[PDB]
Design a protein around this ligand. Structure first.
Ligand SMILES: Cc1c[nH]nc1[C@H]1CCCN(c2ccc3ncnc(N)c3n2)C1
Ligand SMILES: [Mg+2]
Lengths: 275, 297
């Protein structure tokens, strides 16, 4: 009924990602040494928010909520969750030679993202910021989503779906659950190519082009037909005909992963070697 | 040793004085002269380092100016081969906070008209120096105009010709906050390519004047994406209040011409009566100095 001061419960250790997520810290549960991620927030209710981030983060593919705390003074609110210690999908691809992942790696991670999205969507929650930086790895190569569901800045636009970007015919630009699926496909091109489509454009020009351009495509024809088809489904231009999270889960590229165990094993090792 | 066309190691030239936690800005000093500095520290990859060099080549030259917080240069503090280096962007230290701090520390988040005219003129003077040397500031706003302990008004400059503090680092991909952006910098149905022109700073100057007058830029009640959509489409913004002088309405009107091709120059705006005609100048300077001194205690 009343949140406490964090002192003696959680402590901050260092900023993450040293300046990519903003006021987000690697922190530590004092009494156990267990690591936690901690968003620090100037504030002036919250019990309801947290309780809601509580209920929806109980899925193996979503970083689990821990709790909230208030540090007195403009007061501070600490939002605390499970720490994902092997970094982001974006990190991974950056630390891999050729900046590209094995197609079966991409198939595995994409499916875990979709399972996480499936969970939120059936609960009528939209993530709204799916991208490499928001998909995090553990040491066991578990895949978990963060940053789902002040606000004065606009972030990076490269993962945004067409319908999310206001323009003359779309002045009240939707967020629909299907917007997350577009973002998922962009993240898959990212894993494949090291960067999202339009990475070579100024952010503002990208924002202009996304609603106008045809669906992005993989640059290389080296990829399997299944991969190209998965990409096409995530990247249905008009969200109205875009497949649901459940349809993408049955897509052959996601559904048929014969070498799953070895893939996990490979990622795990790659993480060790890549650290 | 100040060297603007090069990318040096800072050791021996500039040092951090406060410990670095997190493009955060920390207090620092010139090693030889002990003059203070403000230092913006950004983690960078070795590829971004080569982008830097390039952009340094595009740096346009301009001298010191009393209405610009002097840019002292770019430096690289190396980290181990398995780690990102620190880009240091180094600037004159201004100790009395920003115009935004000034407003919010004011009773009622509003400045008196003669204050706005004074600060607006200093801003325009700083811009004129950049513009005459073919440089665009690109980020005029309350937060980026600073006060010295001596009530001097100076534009933030961490290398605005090269825009280095925007082009690299893991935020160079962010669109950013839209409220001070001129219509021509926002990609829209009728603006396929983003114009950046010197007159863009003048629109931002007009928005900053509203910020000083009202405590916040227009459309502050809007989510940033919505504001981004509305700026190119709405007629020019204006003051809510009818209390202000005809001169002030006219200054805002001059700044906020929607078509930049038809917007006045900096030199033209410096001759606008609201800027040109300032009978209480001396008194204003005295009032800012005192306000500053007060706030310090
Ligand atoms: C900590 C928090 C509380 N509410 N929302 C959050 C988000 C902020 C955005 C990034 N999100 C990250 C970023 C990097 C991370 N790195 C490691 N583990 C994490 N959980 C982690 N989370 C966490
Ligand atoms: Mg969970």
């Amino acid at each position: 009924s009343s949140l406490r001061d964090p002192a003696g419960i959680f402590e901050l250790v260092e900023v993450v990602g040293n300046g990519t997520y903003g006021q987000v810290y690697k922190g530590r549960h004092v009494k156990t040494g267990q690591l936690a991620a901690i968003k620090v927030m100037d504030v002036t209710e919250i019990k309801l928010e947290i309780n809601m981030l509580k209920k929806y983060s109980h899925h193996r593919n979503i970083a689990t909520y821990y709790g909230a705390f208030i540090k007195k003074s403009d007061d501070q609110l600490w939002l605390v969750m499970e720490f994902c210690g092997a970094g982001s999908i974006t990190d991974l691809v950056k630390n891999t030679k050729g900046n590209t992942l094995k197609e079966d790696w991409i198939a595995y991670i994409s499916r875990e993202i979709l399972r996480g999205l499936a969970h939120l969507h059936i609960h009528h929650v939209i993530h709204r910021d799916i991208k490499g930086q928001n998909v995090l790895l553990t040491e066991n190569a578990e895949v978990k989503l963060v940053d789902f569901g002040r606000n004065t800045f606009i972030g990076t636009p490269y993962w945004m779906a067409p319908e999310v970007i206001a323009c003359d015919e779309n002045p009240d630009a939707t967020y629909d659950y299907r917007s997350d699926l577009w973002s998922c496909g962009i993240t898959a091109i990212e894993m494949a190519e090291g960067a999202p489509p339009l990475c070579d454009m100024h952010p503002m020009r990208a924002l202009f082009l996304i609603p106008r351009n045809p669906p992005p495509r993989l640059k290389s024809k080296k990829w399997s037909k299944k991969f190209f088809s998965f990409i096409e489904g995530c990247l249905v231009k008009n969200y109205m005909q875009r497949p649901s999270t459940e349809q993408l889960l049955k897509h052959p590229f996601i559904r048929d992963q014969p070498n799953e165990r070895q893939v996990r094993i490979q990622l795990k090792d790659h993480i060790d070697r890549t650290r």
